[PDB]
Design a protein around this ligand. Structure first.
Ligand SMILES: NC(=[NH2+])NC[C@H]1Cc2ccccc2[C@@H]1NC(=O)C(=O)Nc1ccc(Cl)c(F)c1
Ligand SMILES: *[C@@H]1O[C@H](CO)[C@@H](O)[C@H](O)[C@H]1NC(C)=O
Ligand SMILES: *[C@@H]1O[C@H](CO)[C@@H](O)[C@H](O)[C@H]1NC(C)=O
Ligand SMILES: *[C@@H]1O[C@H](CO)[C@@H](O)[C@H](O)[C@H]1NC(C)=O
Ligand SMILES: *[C@@H]1O[C@H](CO)[C@@H](O)[C@H](O)[C@H]1NC(C)=O
Ligand SMILES: *[C@@H]1O[C@H](CO)[C@@H](O)[C@H](O)[C@H]1NC(C)=O
Ligand SMILES: *[C@@H]1O[C@H](CO)[C@@H](O)[C@H](O)[C@H]1NC(C)=O
Ligand SMILES: *[C@@H]1O[C@H](CO)[C@@H](O)[C@H](O)[C@H]1NC(C)=O
Ligand SMILES: *[C@@H]1O[C@H](CO)[C@@H](O)[C@H](O)[C@H]1NC(C)=O
Length: 339
C-alpha cells in the first residue's frame, strides 16, 4: 500500500577516497557505497502515474550539485547579489562520477520501464528499487552530455508542447560523439569541438521526423538562439575545470538534412552562474592539451512563438535551467511511501 510522497533522499557512489578529483572527494564525504547486489522488483498488473516535471527528486539532486560546486569550484571573484567576494581559487581536478539516489526505510522508488515513456501519465510496466541508476551530474546547456539513452525511439519530452515557453527535452536513442579540444602551444582561450557530421545529420533528421508526429506534420525548422546571454546562445559546459563556450550554428543548420564539423569555442573565466543570479570570475586555463570527448545524449529546444498561421515550426537550442538536465535522467522514477 503506497502513496506519492517526498522524503529526504541519500546518495551512493563508487568514489575513491584517495582521489583529489572533486566529485570523488564530495561523494566520499557525502554518499555511501553502492549496493553490489541491488534488487529490482517487477509489479504485475499495476499502472502508476508519473510526472517528471513535478518531482522532488529533481530538487534534491540540484541541491547536491549546488553544494558540490560551492565547495569545489570556487571563483576568485563572486558577485552574488549586491556584494563582492574575493577569495582563493586554485585549479582543481574535475570529472563527474555517477551518483545514485536512494530512499530511506519506509519508502521506495518506483521506476517506469515502458520503453516509449514520455515522462508524464500512466506507466504499464512499473517496478520498485532501492536506488536509481548512477547519474553523472553533468552541467551543460543546449546538448545533454554523457547521460542515458532512450531505449527504442527518440523521445520528445515537455511539460506541455502547445506552450512554447516550456523547454523541450529531446531524448536520443543513439549517441553522437563530440570531441572538444584546447590545444597546447597564441590564444590560450581558443578551442574547437569536432563532431562526425554524417552521424549528426542522420540523427537530426530523425528528430525532425519525431517532432512532426507531435506537431501535426508541420515543417520542422532549426535556428540559432535569438538572444540571451552567452551561456545559452552557445553550448556551454565544463571540461577538466575549464568553462567551454561553443558555437553550434553548424549543428543547427537545416541544409544538410557530411564531413567533420568543427565548432569554434572559447574558454571563459567570467561566467553567469547556473546556480542563479550572479556572475563569477575563474582563473585562466591550465597549460597543456585540454580535452573532453563526450556523448551527446539529449538536446534542449525552445520553440518559436507566433507561428500558428503558418505551416512552420521553428526550434532553437536552449537550456539554462539545470533542473532540466537532471529531469532528463530522473523522469523514470517517483518516490512513494509504504505503509
Ligand atoms: N542568471 C543567472 N546567472 N542564473 C540563472 C539561471 C537560470 C536560467 C533560466 C533560463 C535561462 C538562463 C538561466 C540561468 N542559467 C545560467 O546562468 C547558466 O546556465 N550558466 C551556466 C554556467 C556554466 C555552465 Cl558550464 C553552464 F552549463 C551554464
Ligand atoms: C531511433 O528512433 C528512430 C525513431 O525516432 C528510429 O527510426 C530508429 O530506428 C532508432 N534508432 C536506433 C539507433 O535504434
Ligand atoms: C505523454 O503521454 C501522455 C498521455 O499518455 C500525453 O498526455 C502527453 O501529451 C505526452 N507528452 C508528450 C510531450 O508527448
Ligand atoms: C498548454 O499550453 C497551452 C498554450 O499556452 C495552454 O492553452 C494550456 O493551458 C496548456 N495545457 C495545460 C494542460 O495546461
Ligand atoms: C580528439 O581530438 C583530437 C583530434 O582533433 C585528438 O588528439 C584526440 O585523440 C581525439 N580523440 C578522439 C577520441 O577522437
Ligand atoms: C563518421 O560517420 C560515418 C557514418 O556514420 C562513419 O561511417 C565513419 O566511419 C565516421 N568517420 C569517422 C569519425 O571515422
Ligand atoms: C503525417 O503523415 C502521414 C501521411 O503522410 C499520416 O499518416 C499521419 O497521420 C500524419 N501525422 C500527423 C499529421 O500527425
Ligand atoms: C556563431 O558563429 C557564427 C559564425 O557564422 C556567428 O555568425 C554567430 O553570430 C555566432 N553565435 C554567437 C553566439 O556568437
Ligand atoms: C563525458 O565522459 C567522458 C568519458 O568519461 C569524459 O572524458 C568527459 O570529461 C565527460 N564530459 C563532460 C562534459 O564532463
Amino acid at each position: 500500500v503506497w502513496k506519492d510522497a517526498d522524503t529526504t533522499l541519500f546518495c551512493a557512489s563508487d568514489a575513491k577516497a584517495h582521489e583529489t578529483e572533486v566529485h570523488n572527494v564530495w561523494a566520499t564525504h557525502a554518499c555511501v557505497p553502492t549496493d553490489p547486489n541491488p534488487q529490482e522488483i517487477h509489479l504485475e498488473n499495476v499502472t502508476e502515474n508519473f510526472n517528471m516535471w513535478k518531482n522532488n527528486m529533481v530538487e534534491q539532486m540540484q541541491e547536491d550539485v549546488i553544494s558540490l560546486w560551492d565547495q569545489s569550484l570556487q571563483p576568485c571573484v563572486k558577485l552574488t547579489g549586491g556584494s563582492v567576494i574575493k577569495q582563493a581559487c586554485p585549479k582543481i581536478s574535475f570529472d563527474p562520477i555517477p551518483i545514485h539516489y536512494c530512499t530511506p526505510a519506509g519508502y521506495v522508488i518506483l521506476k517506469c520501464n515502458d520503453k516509449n515513456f514520455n515522462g508524464t501519465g500512466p506507466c504499464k510496466n512499473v517496478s520498485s528499487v532501492q536506488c536509481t541508476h548512477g547519474i553523472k551530474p553533468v552541467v551543460s546547456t543546449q546538448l545533454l552530455l554523457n547521460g542515458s539513452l532512450a531505449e527504442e525511439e527518440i523521445i520528445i519530452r515537455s511539460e506541455n508542447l502547445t506552450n512554447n515557453a516550456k523547454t523541450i527535452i529531446v531524448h536520443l536513442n543513439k549517441s553522437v560523439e563530440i570531441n572538444c579540444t584546447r590545444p597546447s602551444n597564441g590564444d590560450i582561450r581558443k578551442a574547437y569541438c569536432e563532431i562526425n557530421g554524417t552521424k549528426w545529420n542522420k540523427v537530426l533528421k530523425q528528430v525532425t521526423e519525431k517532432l512532426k508526429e507531435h506537431f501535426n506534420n508541420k515543417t520542422i525548422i532549426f535556428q540559432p538562439p535569438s538572444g540571451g546571454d552567452l551561456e545559452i546562445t552557445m553550448h556551454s559546459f565544463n571540461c577538466r575545470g575549464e568553462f567551454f563556450y561553443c558555437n553550434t550554428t553548424q549543428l543547427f543548420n537545416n541544409t544538410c538534412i557530411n564531413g567533420t564539423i568543427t565548432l569554434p569555442c572559447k574558454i571563459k573565466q567570467i561566467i553567469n552562474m547556473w546556480q542563479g543570479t550572479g556572475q563569477a570570475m575563474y582563473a585562466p586555463p591550465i597549460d597543456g592539451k585540454i580535452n573532453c570527448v563526450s556523448n551527446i545524449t539529449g538536446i534542449l529546444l525552445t520553440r518559436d512563438g507566433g507561428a500558428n498561421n503558418t505551416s512552420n515550426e521553428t526550434f532553437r537550442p536552449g537550456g539554462g535551467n539545470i533542473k532540466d538536465n537532471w529531469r532528463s535522467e530522473l523522469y523514470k522514477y517517483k518516490v512513494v511511501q509504504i505503509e
